[PDB]
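Please produce the structure of this protein holding magnesium ion.
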Amino acid sequence: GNRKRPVPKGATYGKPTNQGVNELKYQRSLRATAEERVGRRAANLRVLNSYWVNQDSTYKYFEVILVD
Amino acid sequence: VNVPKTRKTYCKGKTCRKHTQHKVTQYKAGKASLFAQGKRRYDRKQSGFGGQTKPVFHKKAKTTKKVVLRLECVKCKTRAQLTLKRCKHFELGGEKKQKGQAL
Amino acid sequence: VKELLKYSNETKKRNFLETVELQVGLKNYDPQRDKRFSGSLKLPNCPRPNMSICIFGDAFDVDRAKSCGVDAMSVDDLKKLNKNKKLIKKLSKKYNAFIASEVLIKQVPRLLGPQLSKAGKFPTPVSHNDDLYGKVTDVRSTIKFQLKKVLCLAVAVGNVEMEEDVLVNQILMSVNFFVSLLKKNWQNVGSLVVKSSMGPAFRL
RNA sequence: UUGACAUUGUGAAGAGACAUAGAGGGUGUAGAAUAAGUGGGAGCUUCGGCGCCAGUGAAAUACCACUACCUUUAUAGUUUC
RNA sequence: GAAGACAUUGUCAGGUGGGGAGUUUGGCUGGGGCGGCACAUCUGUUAAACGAUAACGCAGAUGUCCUAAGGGGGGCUCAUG
RNA sequence: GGGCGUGUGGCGUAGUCGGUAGCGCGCUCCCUUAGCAUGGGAGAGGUCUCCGGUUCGAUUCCGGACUCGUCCGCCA
Ligand SMILES: [Mg+2]
Ligand SMILES: [Mg+2]
Ligand SMILES: [Mg+2]
Ligand SMILES: [Mg+2]
Ligand SMILES: [Mg+2]
Ligand SMILES: [Mg+2]
Ligand SMILES: [Mg+2]
Ligand SMILES: [Mg+2]
Ligand SMILES: [Mg+2]
Ligand SMILES: [Zn+2]
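Below is the modeled complex.
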């Protein structure tokens, strides 16, 4: 899904062009988030690539290749 | 005002080039199309966050609009336009005035 | 093309149980609104005869009255003061001449039942007096139409086969293209059955 | 908060709607009948019954060639609960 | 044990939403406000016999109306006594 | 701007294409009662908002204008 803007109670304190909270989109891919979290888990390794394996309504599933 | 349904006037249709008979109707504006460039640009500007992005007129002052006669040449179907002065009431049906009659 | 010669090639000769006059109508739908502008119209051109029992009451009483009696079938004069009130009932077409232009005295009381009043649909003051007699006597619907549709005319007598219906059809069913809009279907004449009183039923 | 789509797989009935065939019916007026149309004219017809020229009724009345409108109903096709 | 392809969750779409955000809320003017418009204009006067000329000066008017109340021609003469 | 409706006597209204149209209050005038009130009747009262068309014939059906009322819509 989208990236809900992490502001308290939806208040942004500025112009109406920046009042958006809900329909905002993260500029990186869910696959990129997956690789970042896996690399943080195994910081001794190096991320080579990744690929989609499955999805449902809540989760997307990736397999990450790493090299020691 | 009362304007007749026919009028003999000049026709610049490249085959008439003279006074011919014309049918007179009232001009109506016509439906504002999508895919006109201004409408496309306006919809693009309106989409997303930021609210209303163009002015919306409020301080109306006229009580009339100018009437445009659209004239159809009966020979070559060439159309002409002419605008009249401001009038509160307009009629094309010709009920001519009569002078020496009762009220 | 509706049919070249198919399904109506000989199904009018082999069915002779009644040799008497066989007139079959052609009824089909095209629905329209309540207006009265572009309905029953379309006087066509057609070569088949009618051999009907109608009356042509032409009003022209110069000494070519017998020329009118051999080119037509009734001569009338303008003594219209108590002539007709309830006589004219059997008619397929009428015709008049130069002297029927100011007949509004006799026009209102009796030209109301069949409604053959001299309106823009009924142009009897005709100057051409030799051309609309032997060929236009054949049936053609030039009347006032109802709230929905009036489309019925006989295309052929049962004694006449399709040797002229191969040619009157495609000059005939192009009916309302010249005045009406295309709310109607393209050549909306479709499923028809030829039966005056004794024909069989055929479907497209 | 409401709807749609996705998450989302497996079965039953019932009720509609649209098409598809059939079915009968209809106010004043009066001629010859509770008259809702349509072009043609007298006959196909067990009857001389119904209509023709006959009257009158806004309209001619056997006959439908199309059903103008229905649901009161029957079957299988699509679709919506 | 319950519940079940409905909830839930995701994305779009319509409603509601001073709970919250951002902003705005004319001018002239014997201070400002209330009033008025002297804010775009027209006639007469103030206006000092070319032109120009102020005041919330004076007396008034405009946002319309007319297929004739426009154009051409002919005939005729009005208020009043 | 679009869509959906309304317009009837001095007033409030109902209405089948066979209606200048039925009602209820206002006015009069009779009747009933010994009489007054209450009651019951009859008579005047609507060019059906206006203009055209359709229909054999429209308050009624259709088209246009005026007024009013809902909902939706909004870059000169
Ligand atoms: Mg997220
Ligand atoms: Mg900020
Ligand atoms: Mg976009
Ligand atoms: Mg948006
Ligand atoms: Mg605020
Ligand atoms: Mg100020
Ligand atoms: Mg001067
Ligand atoms: Mg003048
Ligand atoms: Mg003069
Ligand atoms: Zn021209």
